[PDB]
Each structure stands twice: as structure tokens, then as C-alpha cells.
Amino acid sequence: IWLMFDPRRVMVAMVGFLAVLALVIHFILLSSQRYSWIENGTLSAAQAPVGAS
Amino acid sequence: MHRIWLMFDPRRVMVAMVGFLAVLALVIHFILLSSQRYSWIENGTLSAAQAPVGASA
Amino acid sequence: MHRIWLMFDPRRVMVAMVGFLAVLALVIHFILLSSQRYSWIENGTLSAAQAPVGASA
Amino acid sequence: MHRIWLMFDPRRVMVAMVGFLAVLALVIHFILLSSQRYSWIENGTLSAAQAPVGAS
Amino acid sequence: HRIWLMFDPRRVMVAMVGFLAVLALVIHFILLSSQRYSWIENGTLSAAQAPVGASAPAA
Amino acid sequence: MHRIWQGMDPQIIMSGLGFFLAGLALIIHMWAYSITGWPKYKKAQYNAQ
Amino acid sequence: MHRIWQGMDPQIIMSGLGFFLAGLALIIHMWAYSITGWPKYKKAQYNAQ
Amino acid sequence: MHRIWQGMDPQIIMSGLGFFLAGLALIIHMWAYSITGWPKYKKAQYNAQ
Amino acid sequence: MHRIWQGMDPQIIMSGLGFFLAGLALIIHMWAYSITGWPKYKKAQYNAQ
Amino acid sequence: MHRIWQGMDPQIIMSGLGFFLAGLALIIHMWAYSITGWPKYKKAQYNA
Amino acid sequence: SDIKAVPADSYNGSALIPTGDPMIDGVGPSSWANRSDTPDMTFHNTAKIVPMRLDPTYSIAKGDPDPRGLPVVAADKQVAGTVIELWVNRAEPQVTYYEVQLTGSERRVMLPAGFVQWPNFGLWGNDKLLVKAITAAQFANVPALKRDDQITLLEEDMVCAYYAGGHLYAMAERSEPII
Amino acid sequence: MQYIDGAQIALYAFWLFFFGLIIYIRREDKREGYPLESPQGPREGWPAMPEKKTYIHRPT
Amino acid sequence: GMTEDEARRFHGYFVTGTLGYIIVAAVAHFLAWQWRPWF
Amino acid sequence: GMTEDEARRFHGYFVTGTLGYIIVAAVAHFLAWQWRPWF
Amino acid sequence: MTEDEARRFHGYFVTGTLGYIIVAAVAHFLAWQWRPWF
Amino acid sequence: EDEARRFHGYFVTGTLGYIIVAAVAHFLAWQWRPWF
Amino acid sequence: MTEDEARRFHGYFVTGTLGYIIVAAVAHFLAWQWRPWF
Amino acid sequence: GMTEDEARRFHGYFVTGTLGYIIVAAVAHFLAWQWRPWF
Amino acid sequence: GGMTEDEARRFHGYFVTGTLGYIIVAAVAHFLAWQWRPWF
Amino acid sequence: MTEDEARRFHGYFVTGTLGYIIVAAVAHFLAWQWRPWF
Amino acid sequence: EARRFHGYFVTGTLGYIIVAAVAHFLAWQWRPWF
Amino acid sequence: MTEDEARRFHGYFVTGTLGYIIVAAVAHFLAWQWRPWF
Numbered sequence A: 001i002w003l004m005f006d007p008r009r010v011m012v013a014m015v016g017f018l019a020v021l022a023l024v025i026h027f028i029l030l031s032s033q034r035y036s037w038i039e040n041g042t043l044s045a046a047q048a049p050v051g052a053s
Numbered sequence B, C: 001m002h003r004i005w006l007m008f009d010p011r012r013v014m015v016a017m018v019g020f021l022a023v024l025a026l027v028i029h030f031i032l033l034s035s036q037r038y039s040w041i042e043n044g045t046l047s048a049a050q051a052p053v054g055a056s057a
Numbered sequence D: 001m002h003r004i005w006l007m008f009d010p011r012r013v014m015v016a017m018v019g020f021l022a023v024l025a026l027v028i029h030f031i032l033l034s035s036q037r038y039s040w041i042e043n044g045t046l047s048a049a050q051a052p053v054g055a056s
Numbered sequence E: 001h002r003i004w005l006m007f008d009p010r011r012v013m014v015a016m017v018g019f020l021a022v023l024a025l026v027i028h029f030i031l032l033s034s035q036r037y038s039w040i041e042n043g044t045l046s047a048a049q050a051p052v053g054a055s056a057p058a059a
Numbered sequence F, G, H, I: 001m002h003r004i005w006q007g008m009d010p011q012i013i014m015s016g017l018g019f020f021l022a023g024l025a026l027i028i029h030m031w032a033y034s035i036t037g038w039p040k041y042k043k044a045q046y047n048a049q
Numbered sequence J: 001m002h003r004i005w006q007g008m009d010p011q012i013i014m015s016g017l018g019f020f021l022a023g024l025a026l027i028i029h030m031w032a033y034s035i036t037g038w039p040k041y042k043k044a045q046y047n048a
Numbered sequence K: 001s002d003i004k005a006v007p008a009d010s011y012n013g014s015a016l017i018p019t020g021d022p023m024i025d026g027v028g029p030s031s032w033a034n035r036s037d038t039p040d041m042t043f044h045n046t047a048k049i050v051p052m053r054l055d056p057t058y059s060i061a062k063g064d065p066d067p068r069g070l071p072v073v074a075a076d077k078q079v080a081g082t083v084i085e086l087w088v089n090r091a092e093p094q095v096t097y098y099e100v101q102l103t104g105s106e107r108r109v110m111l112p113a114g115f116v117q118w119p120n121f122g123l124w125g126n127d128k129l130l131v132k133a134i135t136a137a138q139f140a141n142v143p144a145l146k147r148d149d150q151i152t153l154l155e156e157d158m159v160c161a162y163y164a165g166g167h168l169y170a171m172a173e174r175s176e177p178i179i
Numbered sequence L: 001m002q003y004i005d006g007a008q009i010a011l012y013a014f015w016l017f018f019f020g021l022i023i024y025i026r027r028e029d030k031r032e033g034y035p036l037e038s039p040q041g042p043r044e045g046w047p048a049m050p051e052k053k054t055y056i057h058r059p060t
Numbered sequence M, N, R: 001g002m003t004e005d006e007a008r009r010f011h012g013y014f015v016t017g018t019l020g021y022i023i024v025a026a027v028a029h030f031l032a033w034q035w036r037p038w039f
Numbered sequence O, Q, T, V: 001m002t003e004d005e006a007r008r009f010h011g012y013f014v015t016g017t018l019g020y021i022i023v024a025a026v027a028h029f030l031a032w033q034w035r036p037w038f
Numbered sequence P: 001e002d003e004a005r006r007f008h009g010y011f012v013t014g015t016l017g018y019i020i021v022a023a024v025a026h027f028l029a030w031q032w033r034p035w036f
Numbered sequence S: 001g002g003m004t005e006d007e008a009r010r011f012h013g014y015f016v017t018g019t020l021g022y023i024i025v026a027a028v029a030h031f032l033a034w035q036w037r038p039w040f
Numbered sequence U: 001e002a003r004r005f006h007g008y009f010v011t012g013t014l015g016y017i018i019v020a021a022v023a024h025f026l027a028w029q030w031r032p033w034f
């Protein structure tokens, strides 16, 4: 199992990958109209912006 | 048939395919996010009938 | 917990985590300061009702 | 407790701590100077009622 | 008083003097930039005539 | 059935139980506050009068 | 029969079973909340006063 | 016809069959939900009572 | 029951607990202030003079 | 009961108690100033 | 204490003061690396740096002064010897070392071409070689070779380090502030 | 979407690639003179020093 | 990992907990059926 | 780590501690139901 | 830390917990007569 | 291998525990503002 | 690096690849019910 | 991998496990047909 | 490690009587403040 | 770094980490009452 | 020993925070930020 | 270097620091009379 990949390298690579992905998703939502939660997080689901039909 | 792993190194190959799969997945997700019909962050709550459709000619 | 400090140097983890938390705290603080609702240096004395809200649609 | 100094030498930690505190203090003082409410060099003598407040 | 065993007094003196000179110059330069304390031009004004900064009124 | 605990530190068992119980209890208290309307209704009693 | 567990780790089996049960119970509870509409209707009764 | 299983790890067959059945039942269930109209009709009763 | 404290520093337990208690007492005091409205009503009685 | 202090520095204990007492008394005095309206009403009396 | 240098004071980060004569003990700018004790080889397993007398196919390009038999003016403006043989690089054809016979002969020393300057930057009369790195007396303490026809990388470092270390240690003035 | 556009996505992909490249080159920079010597003991910055690299020489 | 004797004992306990989980779940569905019956 | 002898004794404490948490939480839900039923 | 000193420490811990819990119970009783929260 | 199998126990539990917590986070976000 | 090694690797590699494909099949069927692209 | 006896014992279990799976699926489809037939 | 068992026994005596004197003094301060401006 | 040192350090690291979370929890509750973001 | 430096580092740190706490008290009386 | 010279130096350093603070206090009091900033 963990004899071909050196778990130490994998954990540091995996933590870095998860941290980068989490920041990317959080920032993409923050740039959107519907999920800019810092400004409009107090709106209800019906009040939230929706893209045009 | 497992002798293919004696011709290509399993460690190198599986790292390459994990990297290639991740790049492909990100490319497809980002192409859909840039489109009009599948910009799901904004218009994901629309039903299939209300979703945008490209111009018909 | 059992062998996490034996395989990872605690001094390297101590410095890495301290530096990461400092950068993250500054990033969150600067994001809030740049926003309208949580620009607390200017509008921190406003109550929750009078604070800015994003436009609804 | 004190055994953190058997892991981090007191001299290096003190220099980094002093450097971080000085940069933080200057950043906060300069952030307040750039604001309307806390530009104390300019308004300064205004009372808390006269001080600027951000738009509602 | 033992701080001089762990640090060279010669080098601490130079670092301290350099830091104080930079800080003093920065504060004097910031005040020279300000309207209220631009003393070279308006130093002769009394406190009743000194500029006071304010925000724009509501109307 | 008691032989499941063999091999692992009892501190880890209890340390990982508090995280579960504290995490769950905070979710359900938030879940229950909105469902029952407490302390919204009691807070509004003392604010109005 | 019982030989399927041979060569395995008891903690791995229980870790993956708890993952299964926790993940499935989350999906079906949200499935059941939308079908019955339970928390919504009872929340409306208490949050209208 | 037991000669197929000779030379393959039993945990692999069971875990590879579990992936198949779990994913197939998920697809057919969503396939069946749209055909029968369930739970749309039942959800309409409770959510529009 | 007393063997949970085996191989543990009493100073660390009292530091971990008394600092759990300090944070929880601060959160619930703030929770109780907004529920009862205590400082508000008494402060307004002295701020009207 | 006394054994909790075993192995600990008495000056560290007194330093951490002075920190607690000074920081806590500064928060509650601010708390108490706004509740009672203490300096405000008397300052307004003399500064009239 | 195998490097023959002592710290100035007890404050860390302080500079070392050499105990003996830093030119020979190899301290600071006179330090050399422990390279391999074998000669460098060309593409055809032959010594890379050799004297011209071992290979008569090499010559000096026309319009270039023949430095053999020319005086070697050291940092004292006193002749330290005469060039008698050139050592060339066969991998890439270029003069690498000069062999200098001292004034009272009785010994021959090497001189890297990197420390050799020509009068007037080699524009006007080229009648001598300028060596600003070392004094005429320290030419006698340049490390010698094991053989008279090849030079290993170990000694190659030693000769170059010795000359380069004399920009700080040739005279006491060279290791002092200008103001 | 609206604020997110192709140029921004490409720029951030380049930023990730550049940071990875800088990590790789900094790893290569530590193949000589490492680990560092300090009174507290051996020291390595981030990234850590790589494995020993051996060359190949022609036979004599 | 586990031995054949260890696995025989594990399987009996795992089976015991499986039906115990299922019976207790059956009561939950019975109680929920009377409250708001689906289909 | 953990041995067989101390695993049964720990299990006995764990079961009675787990069980007591259940009745203690059972009264809380019963007390909450009389106050505001959620069905 | 050891077996024997964790028996006496646990006794000191339990009595401190009950005394803390009892004194908090009196606080909640006095707060309920002043401003009940239900 | 004794050391590899012991690490596999903590890694698998940590991965599965991390995913469950992320699933709870998506459940809370769905109640606040669903994206479908 | 041997014939025996490929036996253990292939079983986990095939199971992992098959699991990845099946979950992608579920994801594509879910996306089709939500917003079909044909 | 497996042996002759291992594959023979495994195959018998896998067939009754398969067959038992079909019977319960047959009942589910039969129950679903009375409720909402799909043809 | 400083403050052995004998030192910790004696320090616990002064620390306990120090707390009591501080609390008693604070009791008077709260009593005086209550007659001036009661907070309930 | 042996197993003995990895235990005394872990007790101080967990306690310091838990204290960091508690202060952050108090700060988040304090900020929620001032200006909630949901 | 590290015990000697710990006593001076802790007392210096807690003293610095208390003096900064007083500075925040003075600034609050002059111009509150909440 | 020696503690005898570490006592001589610290005496002048503290007095020099004290002298610098006092003249700065006088300067700040002079500026406050001329043009106060609060």
C-alpha cells in the first residue's frame, strides 16, 4: 500500500491541493452575483440573484 | 492482462493520468461555467425549459 | 497523534502553521475591510439594520 | 512550557516577534490614517458626535 | 541589564539610532504633508484659525 | 464485543467523541432554534416590554 | 461466509461502514425533508406568532 | 463453473461488484423517479396542502 | 473511571478546562444579554437623566 | 489541592494573575461605566 | 579548530581572524576546495592542461606577443622572474598558465593567466607582465606540482586560490578600510 | 460567469504553474552546500533539500 | 490482518449489529408512516 | 497501546457512560416536547 | 500521571465539578425568578 | 508491512472523516441557498 | 518490476478505474435529468 | 490468488448471494407494478 | 523544576488568603455601588 | 525526537490549538451579534 | 536555563498587552469604533 | 564584555534613554499648547 509513494510526500501534496482548491472555489463564489455572501448573505433564497432565463 | 505494467512503470503512469485527468476535469468545468446555458453558479436553479438555448438558424 | 510528530518535524510544522494562519487572517481581514457591509473602520458604529446589503433580485 | 526555548532559540524568536509587531503597528496606524473617521492628524479635535460615519 | 550579554552594545546603539532617525523623519514628513500641521506655511496661525478636517454634510 | 477497542489509545477514542458530540450538538441546537422560534419569541417579549 | 473478512483490518471496515451510514443518512434525510416538508410546515406555525 | 474465480482476490470481486450495483441502482432509481412521477405527486400534496 | 487521567499532566488538563470554561461562559453571557435585554433596559434608565 | 502548583514558577503564576486581574478589571470598568453612566452625568454637571 | 581562524568576539555572526599566515593555510579568499587529485582529461583521455613543449602542434597566433622570456612585474614594481613556458588548454585552445623562473632561478612556479595584465591594456608596447595580486617575495611560496608535465584539479585550485587570496593579504593596507 | 472571464482563469492557472516551477527550481538550488549548519543543528528551508544526485562519467 | 478465527468472530458480531440496526430502523419507518405516509 | 484486559474494563465504562447520556438526553427531548412539540 | 496519583486527582476533580455545578444551579435559580427565559 | 498498515488506518479514517464533515457543510449551505 | 507484482497492482488499478467510471456515469445521468445537452 | 478449493467455495456463496438478490428484486418489481405499472 | 511539594504547600496558603482578602474587598465595593446605582 | 518527547509536546500543542479555536469561537459569536452575515 | 528566559518573556509579553489594552481604552473614550 | 563594564554601560544607556524621553515629553507638551490634536 504505502510502500511505493512515501506517505510523507503524499500528505504534503494532498494538503496543498485541497487548500488551493478550497480557496479557488471560495473565491469563485465570492465573485458571483448569487453567492457574494459577504455583501448579500443576509438575503433569503427567494431574494438571491438568479441568472437570466 | 497485467504484463502491460512490465512495459510501463506503474508509478510514473498513474501520476501522469491523475494529472491529465485533473487538468481535463478543470478545463471542462471552466468551459461550462463560461457558457450561457450551463453557468450553474448563477442560473443553476432554472428548470430545463427556462435554461438558455443557442440561436436557431 | 500517535506518530504524527515522529514523522513530521514539529519545529517545521510550528513555523509553517504560524505563517499560514497569519497570512490567512490578514487575507480575511482585508477582504472584509474592502467590502461595503463590513468596512468596520468607517461604518462599525452602525447597527445591523442600517448596515449595507447587496442588491436583491 | 519553557521547553519551547529548547526548540526555538530565544534570540531568533525575539527578533522575528519584534519585526512582526513593528510592521503590524505601522500597518494599523497607516490604515487608520487613510480612513475618514480616524484621520486624527486632520480631524482629531472633532467630538465623537462630529466624527464621520460611513453611509448606511 | 543582561541584555548586553546577548546583544552587542555597539550594534544595538547603531540600530536604535537608525530606527529613531527614520521614525522622526517619517513623522515630521507626514505632518508637513497634512493641512493642519503644515507648520512651515501656517505655523503662525492660532488654534482657532488652524484647519480642521471634516466630512461632507448629508445635504 | 469489547475487543473492538483493542489496539487504539482510549484518549483518541474520547478525543474523537467530543468532536463528534460537540459538532453535532451545535448543528442541532441551531436546527432547533429556528424550528421552535426560541429565543426569538422570548427575546421579542423583553425588547418590546 | 465469514472468510470474506480474512486479511482485513477491523478498524478499516468500521471506518468505511460509518462513512457509508453517515453519508447515506444525510442524503435520505434531505430527501425526506423535501418530500414530507416537515421542518418547513412546523417552522411556519411557530415563526408566525 | 467455479474456475472463473481462480486466481483473483475475493475482496476485489466484492468491492468491484459493489461499485457496479451501487451505481446501477442510483441510475435506475433516478430513471424510475421520472417515469412514475414519484415523489413529485406526493411532495405536491404535503408542500401545497 | 479514574484511570483516564493516567499519563496526563494535571496542569494541562486544568489549563484546557479552565479555558474551555472561560470561552463558554463568555458566549453564554452574550447569549443571555440579548435574550433578557438586561444591560439595555437598566442602561436606558440611567441615560434618560 | 496544593499539589497543582508543584513544578511551577511562582513569579509566572503571579504574572498571569496580574494579567487576568488587570485585563478583567479593565473590561468590567468599561462595562460598568456605560451601564451606570458614571462619568458622563457628573462631567456634564461641572462642564456646563 | 582545523581551519586556523578565531572569532573576533563572542557575538555570533562575527568575522574570523586568521591565526597564522592566511596565504598558506588557506583561509578566506585563500581557501581552496578539495577537488579530485587527478588531472583533467580531454575528449580523448589526454591531459587537458599541458605545457607547449609536450605538444608542438600548438603555437602563438600572429600579432600576439610571445610572453616567453619576458619579465614578470609583481605588486612591488620589482621583477619577480621570467616566463619560460606556457601551459595551454587542449579541450579549448587557450593559454591557462605561465611558468615563471625566479630571479635566482633554482625553482619554477606557475602563474594563472587570469591574474596577468599587460601594459596599456595590451594596446601599446607589451614588454612585461603585470601581476597585481601577489608580491615578488610571495612568488616563492606558490604551491608546487607533483609532476612537471601535468596538473591535477586539486593543485589547480591551490595555485588559483593562493593568487586570488593575495588581493586581501599581500600587504596590511589591502585588508583595511579606505576611510 | 459575468465577473469571471477567460483571461482571469488563464492568469490564475499561470500563477499556479509559476509557483510550482519556483518550488522545483528552489529544490534544485539546494543540491550543493546542504544541509545548513547552525548551533541549534541542521536546517533546511522550504522546499526541503532533494535526494542526492549522481552524475555519470566516461570510462578511462 | 484478521485471522480466520478472528474473522469468524467478527462476522457474527457484525451480523448481530446489522439486524439490530435494521429492526430499529424498521420502527422508525413505521412511526413515520403513520405521521406522513409517502405514496 | 491497548490490551485485551484493559479493553473489557474500558468497554464497561464506555457502555454505562454511553447509556447514561441516552436517558439524560431522553428527558431533555421529553421536556422539550411538552414545551413546544415539533410535529 | 501515574496510577495512584490519578485516583486522588480524579477525586479532587469530581468534587470541584459538583461544587461548580451546584453554584451555577443557584445562579440559574436566581435568574429565573428575575427574568424567566421560557 | 506493519508500519504501512497502521498508517493506512489513520489515513483512511481521516479521509472519510474529512469528506463527511464537508458533506455536512454542503447540507447547511443547501438550506441557506440551494444552487439547483 | 516482476510478473507477480502486476497481479496485485492490476486488481486495485482495475477496481479503481471501474469505480471512477461508474461514478462519472452517475454524474452524467444526474446532469442529464437536470439540464440535457441534446 | 485463489486456489481450486478457494474458488469452489467462493463460487457457491456468490451464486446463492446472487440468487437471493434476484428474489428480493423480483418482489420489489412486483410490488411496484401494482402501485404504478410502467407499461 | 521549582516549587517542590513543600514550597507548593506553603504558597497555596498565601494564595488562598490573598484571594479571600481580595474578594472581601470587592464585596464592599459592590455593596457601596449598589446603594449608589443598583443595576437591577 | 523519540516517543517520550512526542507525548509531552502533543499535550501542549493540543491545548494551545484548542485555546486558539475557543478564542476564535468567542470572536465569531461576538461578531455575529454585532452584524450577522446570514 | 530556559526557565529564566521564560519568566522575563512572559512578564514582558503580558505587560505589553496590558499597556496596549489601556491604549485601546483611551481611544474608545475618544472615538468608539462600534 | 565583563560584567563590570556591563554595569557601567547600562547606567549611561538608561540615563540617556530617560533624557531622550523627557525632552520628547517637553516637545509634545509645547506642541499641544500651540496646536492640540485632540
Ligand code: BCL
Residues within 6 Å of the ligand: G019, G020, G021, G022, G023, G024, G026, G027, G028, G031, H021, H022, H023, H025, H026, H029, H032, H033, H036, H038, P019, P020, P023, R024, R025, R026, R028, R029, R032
Ligand atoms: C419510483 C421507484 C420506487 C422504488 C422501487 C424499487 C425497485 C423496483 C427496486 C428497488 C430496490 C431498492 N430500493 Mg427502492 N424504490 C423507491 C424508493 C426508495 C428509497 C427512497 C427513500 O426513496 C430507498 C432508500 C430505496 C431503497 C432501495 C434499496 C433497498 C434497493 C436497492 C439495493 C441496491 O442494490 O442498492 C445499491 C447499493 C448501494 C450501496 C447504493 C448506495 C447509494 C448511495 C447514494 C451511495 C453513496 C453513499 C455515500 C456514503 C454518500 C456520501 C455523502 C456525500 C455525498 C459524500 N428505494 C421508489 C418508491 N426500489 C431494488 C431492490 O433490490 O429491491 C429489493 C429494486 O429492484
Ligand code: BCL
Residues within 6 Å of the ligand: D018, D019, D021, D022, D025, D029, D032, D038, D040, E027, U011, U012, U013, U014, U015, U016, U019, U020, U021, U023, U024, U027
Ligand atoms: C487612531 C489611532 C490613534 C492611536 C491608537 C493606538 C492604540 C490603540 C495603540 C497604539 C499604540 C502605539 N502607538 Mg498609536 N495612535 C495614534 C497616534 C500615534 C502617534 C502619532 C504620531 O500621532 C504615534 C507616534 C503613536 C505611537 C504608538 C506606539 C508608542 C505604540 C505602538 C508601538 C508598538 O506596537 O510597537 C511594537 C514593536 C515593538 C518593537 C515593541 C517595542 C516595545 C513596546 C513599545 C513596549 C514593550 C513592553 C514594555 C517595556 C512593557 C513591559 C512589561 C512590564 C511588566 C510592564 N501613535 C492615534 C491618535 N496607538 C499601541 C500600544 O501598544 O500602545 C501602548 C496601541 O495598542
Ligand code: BCL
Residues within 6 Å of the ligand: A025, B017, B018, B019, B020, B021, B022, B025, B026, B029, B032, B038, B040, Q016, Q017, Q019, Q020, Q023, Q024, Q025, Q027, Q028, Q031
Ligand atoms: C454544469 C456542470 C456540473 C457538473 C457536472 C459534472 C459531471 C457530469 C461530472 C463531474 C465530475 C466531477 N465534478 Mg463537477 N459539475 C458541477 C459542479 C461541480 C462543483 C461545484 C463547485 O459546483 C465541484 C467542486 C465539482 C466537482 C467534481 C468532481 C467531484 C468530479 C471530477 C473529479 C476529477 O477531478 O476527476 C479528474 C481527476 C483525476 C484524473 C485524478 C483524481 C482521481 C480521483 C480518484 C477522483 C475522486 C473523485 C470521486 C470520488 C471519484 C470516484 C473515485 C473512486 C471512488 C476510486 N463539480 C456542475 C453543477 N461534474 C465528474 C466525475 O467524475 O464525477 C464523479 C463528472 O463526470
Ligand code: BCL
Residues within 6 Å of the ligand: C018, C021, C022, C025, C032, C038, C040, D028, I015, I016, I019, I020, T015, T016, T017, T018, T019, T020, T022, T023, T024, T025, T027, T028, T031
Ligand atoms: C469585520 C471583522 C471584525 C473582526 C472579526 C474577527 C473574527 C471573527 C476573528 C478575529 C480574529 C482576530 N482579530 Mg479581528 N476583527 C475586526 C478587527 C480587528 C482589528 C482592528 C484593527 O480593527 C485587529 C487588530 C484585529 C485582530 C485580530 C487578531 C487578534 C485575531 C487573528 C490573529 C491570528 O489568528 O493570527 C494568526 C495566529 C497566530 C500568529 C498564532 C497566535 C497564537 C496565540 C498567541 C497563542 C495560542 C496558544 C496559547 C498556549 C493559548 C493558551 C490559552 C488556553 C490554552 C485556552 N481584529 C473586525 C471588527 N477578528 C480571529 C481569531 O483568530 O481570533 C482568535 C477571529 O476568529
Ligand SMILES: COC(C)(C)C/C=C/C(C)=C/C=C/C(C=O)=C/C=C/C(C)=C/C=C/C=C(C)/C=C/C=C(\C)CC/C=C(C)/C=C/C=C(\C)C(=O)O
Residues within 6 Å of the ligand: F001, F002, F003, F004, G010, G027, G028, G031, H025, H026, H029, H030, M002, M006, M007, M009, M010, M013, M014, M015, M016, M017, M018, M021
Ligand atoms: C435519493 O434516493 C436514492 C438515494 C436514489 C434512493 C436509493 C437508495 C438506495 C439504493 C439505498 C441503499 C441502501 C442500502 C443497501 O444497499 C443500505 C445498506 C445498509 C446496511 C448494510 C447497514 C448495515 C449496518 C450494520 C451495522 C450498523 C453493524 C454494526 C456492527 C457492530 C457495531 C459490531 C462490530 C463488531 C465488533 C465490535 C467485533 C469486534 C471484533 C474484533 C475486532 C475481532 O475479532 O478482532
Ligand SMILES: COC(C)(C)C/C=C/C(C)=C/C=C/C(C=O)=C/C=C/C(C)=C/C=C/C=C(C)/C=C/C=C(\C)CC/C=C(C)/C=C/C=C(\C)C(=O)O
Residues within 6 Å of the ligand: F010, F014, F021, F027, F028, F031, G025, G026, G029, G030, I001, I003, I004, N006, N009, N010, N013, N014, N016, N017, N018, N019, N021
Ligand atoms: C438536522 O438535519 C440532519 C443533520 C440531517 C439531521 C440528521 C441527524 C442525524 C443523522 C444524527 C445522527 C446522530 C447519531 C447517530 O447515531 C448520534 C449518535 C450518538 C452517540 C452514539 C452518542 C454516544 C455518546 C456516548 C458517550 C457520551 C459516552 C461517554 C462515556 C464516558 C464519559 C465514560 C468514559 C470512561 C472512560 C474513558 C474510562 C476509561 C478507563 C480506562 C482507560 C481504564 O480503566 O483503563
Ligand SMILES: COC(C)(C)C/C=C/C(C)=C/C=C/C(C=O)=C/C=C/C(C)=C/C=C/C=C(C)/C=C/C=C(\C)CC/C=C(C)/C=C/C=C(\C)C(=O)O
Residues within 6 Å of the ligand: F025, F026, F029, I010, I014, I017, I027, I028, I031, J001, J002, J003, J004, O005, O008, O009, O012, O013, O014, O015, O016, O017, O020
Ligand atoms: C448559542 O447557544 C449556545 C449557548 C451555544 C447553546 C449551547 C449549547 C451547548 C451544547 C452547550 C454545552 C455545554 C456544556 C457541554 O456539555 C457544558 C459542560 C460543562 C462542564 C463539563 C463543566 C465542568 C467543569 C468542571 C470544573 C469546574 C472542575 C473543577 C475542578 C477543580 C477546581 C479541581 C482541580 C483539581 C486539582 C486542583 C487537583 C490538584 C491535585 C493534584 C494534581 C494531585 O494531588 O496530585
Ligand SMILES: COC(C)(C)C/C=C/C(C)=C/C=C/C(C=O)=C/C=C/C(C)=C/C=C/C=C(C)/C=C/C=C(\C)CC/C=C(C)/C=C/C=C(\C)C(=O)O
Residues within 6 Å of the ligand: A014, A018, A024, A025, A028, B022, B025, B026, B029, B030, B033, C001, C002, C003, C004, P003, P006, P007, P010, P011, P014, P015, P018
Ligand atoms: C468552479 O468549479 C470547479 C473548481 C472548476 C469545479 C471542479 C472541481 C474539481 C475538479 C474537483 C476535484 C475534487 C477532488 C478530486 O480530484 C477532490 C479530492 C478530495 C480528496 C480525495 C480529499 C481527501 C482528503 C484527505 C485528508 C484530508 C486526509 C487526512 C488524513 C489525516 C488527518 C490522518 C493523518 C494522520 C497521521 C499521518 C498520523 C497517524 C499515523 C501514524 C500513527 C503512524 O504512521 O504510525
Ligand SMILES: COC(C)(C)C/C=C/C(C)=C/C=C/C(C=O)=C/C=C/C(C)=C/C=C/C=C(C)/C=C/C=C(\C)CC/C=C(C)/C=C/C=C(\C)C(=O)O
Residues within 6 Å of the ligand: A001, A004, B021, B027, B028, Q005, Q007, Q008, Q009, Q010, Q012, Q013, Q014, Q015, Q016, Q017, Q020
Ligand atoms: C475539453 O474537452 C472537449 C474539447 C470539450 C472535449 C474533450 C475531448 C477529449 C479528447 C476527451 C478525452 C477523454 C479521455 C481520453 O483521452 C478520457 C480518459 C479517461 C480515463 C482513461 C480515465 C481513467 C481513470 C482511471 C483512474 C482514475 C484510476 C485510478 C486507480 C486507482 C485509484 C487504483 C489505485 C491502486 C492502488 C493505490 C494500489 C497500489 C498497489 C500496488 C502498488 C501494489 O500491488 O504493489
Ligand SMILES: COC(C)(C)C/C=C/C(C)=C/C=C/C(C=O)=C/C=C/C(C)=C/C=C/C=C(C)/C=C/C=C(\C)CC/C=C(C)/C=C/C=C(\C)C(=O)O
Residues within 6 Å of the ligand: G001, G002, G003, G004, H010, H027, H031, R006, R007, R009, R010, R013, R014, R015, R016, R017, R018, R021
Ligand atoms: C436508463 O435505463 C438503462 C440504463 C438504459 C437500462 C439498463 C439496461 C441494462 C443493460 C441493465 C443492466 C443490468 C444488469 C446487467 O446485465 C444487471 C446485473 C446484475 C447482477 C449480475 C447482479 C448480481 C448480484 C450479485 C450479488 C448481490 C452477490 C452477492 C454475493 C454475496 C453476498 C456473497 C458474498 C460472500 C462470499 C462470497 C463469501 C466469501 C468466501 C470466501 C472468500 C472463501 O471461502 O474463500
Ligand SMILES: COC(C)(C)C/C=C/C(C)=C/C=C/C(C=O)=C/C=C/C(C)=C/C=C/C=C(C)/C=C/C=C(\C)CC/C=C(C)/C=C/C=C(\C)C(=O)O
Residues within 6 Å of the ligand: I025, I026, I029, I030, J010, J017, J027, J031, S007, S010, S011, S014, S015, S016, S017, S018, S019, S022
Ligand atoms: C461584559 O461582561 C462580561 C465580561 C461578559 C461579564 C463577565 C463574566 C465572567 C465570566 C467573569 C469572570 C469572573 C471570574 C471567573 O471566575 C473571576 C475570577 C476571579 C478570581 C479567581 C480572582 C482571584 C484573585 C486572587 C488574588 C487577588 C490572589 C492574590 C494572592 C496574593 C496577593 C498572594 C501572593 C503570593 C504570595 C505572597 C506567596 C509568595 C511565595 C512564597 C512565600 C513561596 O513560594 O515561598
Ligand SMILES: COC(C)(C)C/C=C/C(C)=C/C=C/C(C=O)=C/C=C/C(C)=C/C=C/C=C(C)/C=C/C=C(\C)CC/C=C(C)/C=C/C=C(\C)C(=O)O
Residues within 6 Å of the ligand: D022, D025, D026, D029, D030, D033, E016, E026, E027, V005, V008, V009, V010, V012, V013, V014, V015, V016, V017, V018, V020
Ligand atoms: C502615524 O505615525 C506613525 C509613525 C505611523 C505612528 C507610529 C507608530 C509606531 C510603531 C511608533 C513606534 C514607537 C516606538 C517603538 O517602540 C518608540 C520607541 C522608542 C524608544 C525605545 C526610544 C529609546 C531611546 C533610547 C536612547 C535615545 C538612548 C540613548 C542612550 C545614550 C545617549 C547613552 C549612550 C552612551 C553610553 C552608553 C556611554 C557609556 C559607555 C560606557 C560606560 C563604556 O564604554 O564602558
